[model samples]
Target: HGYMYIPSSRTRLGHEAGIDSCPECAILEPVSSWPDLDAAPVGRSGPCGYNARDSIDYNQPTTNWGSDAVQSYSPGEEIEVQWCVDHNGDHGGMFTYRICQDQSIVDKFLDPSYLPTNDEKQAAEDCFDAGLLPCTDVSGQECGYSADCTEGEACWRNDWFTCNGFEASDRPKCQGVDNAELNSCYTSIAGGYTVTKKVKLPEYTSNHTLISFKWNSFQTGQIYLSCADIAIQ
Candidate 1:
């Protein structure tokens, strides 16, 4: 289980008592997160994410997370970002921070009273998937393809950041990338480790936008998805 925290993602906000009914519940699993990113459809886990425990889909705004932006920034700004992954679930795979620039689509998710249909959720996820903010988008960043992916392969895109090599003899999972102490961020269960990175905002601007966080686990063949509310000028 991993979730974005740098910009206060919805799931991160869900950690609070009054914000959401469940904490550390936003996660997408039981999918093929390796070799072929598209081998498995997103199913109920759409762009923003789905919390199976709460049976909540983030594609719609919630009282706790969607009403306001947790963080605001300027277009093209190089911003520091963070995600917390449970050391227990650390699979040392790849992760990406994304922003869906299309406001029309995001506007639908902004409505706190509406629940997007499954199809709508998938469409939103598609838009966000297309807007994945690559490490290459940030200057001075060490961008590289995941060792798990072969060159010219489907998962060869370096748009996402990778943890330590999956084949390393030492700490070789997500926690291997950032051996931070446990409970670095809020998690109701066993707690999580924090991995920090930077993402350069796209040139596009939106009063209300989303920064979607995705982690494809190499060990579990699962994917974790979440998003945060933010603004760009």
Candidate 2:
């Protein structure tokens, strides 16, 4: 999955069927979030990238419940949900989680690096290095304090990202029905077969606020996941 930005709005919702790479999973409904005050703040500008500073570290042996939540699971359910976390304490940055489930069964398959021949420790190191190591953004850059940018376009390195501010009038429309079928799919996934009941985050009279998906839990076998800019983050 790649990184994508949610515009700074009280409620900016999007939905989709399966992603381009994973076509087998039939994403039936749209997944939506609201109040992205932190996702992207008004008047903030520069570059937007994901990096160590804004990363979600699993090895830290700690979890924050207040960050944001999305997703609950059962069996035979195809579910997809995302949430953002505050990079506080052990948590260095806010990250989004996207999950897909099938309630049919929990397939505890082999690890990605299973069945190795070399020393277990060596393989473990190799795996750790690959797993915990940093990842470059689409532009192929490294870690740095400020965004590595020229004009006010977009500069990203590894997972770190920065973006320039957009005027209120200049900002793109937050909600649209570009993918009618996908939106319908999401609505169906939410248990509404004919109509979509959206939970919209309230808008404010002041500057735009960012919404965060803190928690999501749902039946596993009942839903599917899709995306457009999941990789752009």
Candidate 3:
């Protein structure tokens, strides 16, 4: 259970002005399958009935990366990114920030006129999961580690992404500085949690790059995603 930034209630006043965090809401599940793609409510989850999942339409323009001001930062800069967990508390999961450096994927958001196909959309997801950004990879980051799946277990196919360890119920496994309370690997309370880390800006500067914030929930079958419109110089 967490908060959602209600897009429908948003106004021109600003993100903080009209937006609210629904505390008692359930996790949001955006379009995951083909059937969800052709259904009502273009981009949203079911329980919360809100599209706060911040998903993208590979077949159309991604014009809503940010509702507030587009953030700007220097290359390899250390900055703080915070998420206000719902009043109910932390939904233990694996969270990270990423950059989609692939020119084609980056270009899609840069150009509002570009429309992508299903294959292109899937390709983008693959590229993002490839860990082009800091801390997204299970092996790339300092604490980023994964466990090997057993021979016949479902999680056996590939290395599972989590903090450095084998225990699935350990919170420090996914712990980073300034994170919310860590009790038995689950969030015990609700509040604002911050992650102060260096943005792994690419060696080359990019204009209109997508800075993605992703949280892979361990407590549920949902992935929370958000993007910031930014330029790295």
Alpha-carbon runs more than 4 Å astray in model 2: 1-51, 54-56, 63-72, 83-233
Candidate 3 lDDT by residue in tens digits, 1-233: 43222111111112343232332232435332111111222133311122332322312322333322355667765445433343343444444555666866656545556544445544554555454454432234354334422345333222222322324444432333334452212112444333333335555456556554444444445554444556666
Q: Considering only N, C-alpha and C atoms within 3 Å, which residue pairs clash in candidate 3?
A: 89-189, 149-156, 163-173, 171-185
**Candidate 1 lDDT over residue span 142-181, tens digit each:** 8777777779987787778888777778767677676788
Q: What's the alpha carbon RMSD for model 1?
A: 1.8
* RMSD to truth, every model: 1.8, 19.3, 8.2
Q: Which run of 10 residues does model 1 get worst, by summed lDDT?
A: 16-25
Candidate number with greatest TM-score: 1
Q: How many residue pairs clash (N, CA or C atoms closer than 3 angstroms) in each of the candidate models, in the order given? A: 1, 61, 4
Winner by lDDT between candidate 3 and candidate 2: 3
Which candidate, 1 or 3, has the higher lDDT?
1
In order of appearance, the predictions have TM-scores of: 0.92, 0.17, 0.54
lDDT by residue (59-155, candidate 2, tens digit) is 1111221111122223222222221111110111112212112111101111222222223322322232232212232133323321213333232
| C-alpha positional error of residue 17 in candidate 3 after TM-score superposition, expressed in Å | 5.8
lDDT computed for candidate 3: 0.39
